[PDB]
Design a protein around this ligand. Structure first.
Ligand SMILES: [Ca+2]
Ligand SMILES: [Ca+2]
Lengths: 224, 224
């Protein structure tokens, strides 16, 4: 938790994301900073290929950083304990209107910097839906539910995306976090939750440049 | 909120549940008491027909009371505002292993006493799953996500059921809460959450007798 740990008080991250949505190929790069133990981070993202994207950047937001989660109480940190080896996370998000977004991400530590590589694939997003019509306005906060499974840590999420008009477009996903470290080489946390608040700070050139910020805290249910 | 409102500081309720699970017919009756504004309640339940049930009572637990939810800041109470007319709630729960439990419930106020009628139908539960094999051990707490929709209030939940061996069986459901009062006759809440903690206190005679307790609080994300 100090200046000598692999995960220091302040950490930087570099990201490369590539894939497609409804057959449209694209690529993004990002760089950010954060305080892992405070569960806070901010990232600057650029669309280097395929921009301006014909779909809402919002569907990519939750795919650009598990190391930055504040842990209190007695909840072992699955991600921080994984280094130097690191970890991966895989996920499938299903939107109520048919769209599906799947991701395979790799997280590594290279020369004190966190490196992310995400391969994403979005399919079946409705032609007239809020996503393909770019009528989204950011995500509401949410609470992820987690417990060990499949040799790793499983997460379940349900989120609501703000859409033009004041309504919401909902989606849910299941994630499997896998450590590159042996199961017997770290403490596995038990059932717990993680509150998340992912917020967009800036944007320009038809979302070809985006600045995101996220606050995340692992904990037990507020109710005693 | 006091003694001149339809919903008193202390309220009692009666419930009749009828339906089937995997084709097995059954009936339950219950009576309880709670403090609506504190968001706490306790209920004694009896299986009057079909007992001993060939499936885990746990799958029925969340179907036996929306009036007992503590509302914090500026979150209009959808349910308390509904009286004297009352409200209904409909829901479909899908378990990760194939089981599906659907419910249609009616909530009314009769002489200061809350009356519940729930018609339930469970189908496709795996013959060798934890539910049909009675290898469940209660629910973990959870956080329901809600926002107005379809002329009422929509709710999304994801829950984890403890099973013999230390593992978990997950499920998720969508609920639509409908007031019997005109939309323009009450204040509709906005997007918000409700933390829930449903616990079994007692059970006897192959679950033909069960005492449940629940604590529920409506609020906004802990992360500001
Ligand atoms: Ca920051
Ligand atoms: Ca749960």
């Amino acid at each position: 938790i100090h200046m000598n740990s692999l995960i220091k008080e302040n950490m930087r991250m570099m990201v490369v994301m590539e894939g497609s949505v409804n057959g449209y190929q694209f690529k993004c790069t990002g760089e950010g900073d954060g305080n892992p133990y405070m569960g806070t981070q901010t990232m600057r993202i650029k669309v280097v290929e395929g921009g301006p994207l014909p779909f809402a950047f919002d569907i990519l937001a939750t795919s650009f950083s598990k190391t930055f989660i504040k842990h209190t109480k007695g909840i072992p940190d699955f991600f921080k304990q994984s280094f130097p080896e690191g970890f991966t996370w895989e996920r499938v998000t299903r939107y109520e209107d048919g769209g599906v977004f799947t991701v395979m991400q790799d997280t590594s530590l290279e020369d004190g910097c966190l490196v992310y590589h995400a391969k994403v694939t979005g399919v079946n997003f409705p032609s007239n839906g809020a996503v393909m019509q770019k009528k989204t306005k950011g995500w509401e906060p949410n609470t992820e539910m987690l417990y060990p499974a499949d040799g790793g840590l499983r997460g379940y999420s349900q989120m609501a995306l703000n859409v033009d008009g004041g309504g919401y477009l909902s989606c849910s996903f299941e994630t499997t976090y896998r450590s590159k470290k042996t199961v017997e080489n770290f403490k596995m946390p038990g059932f717990h939750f993680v509150d998340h608040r992912l917020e967009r700070l800036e944007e320009s050139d038809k979302e070809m440049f985006v600045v995101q910020h996220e606050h995340a805290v692992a904990k037990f249910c507020d109710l005693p």
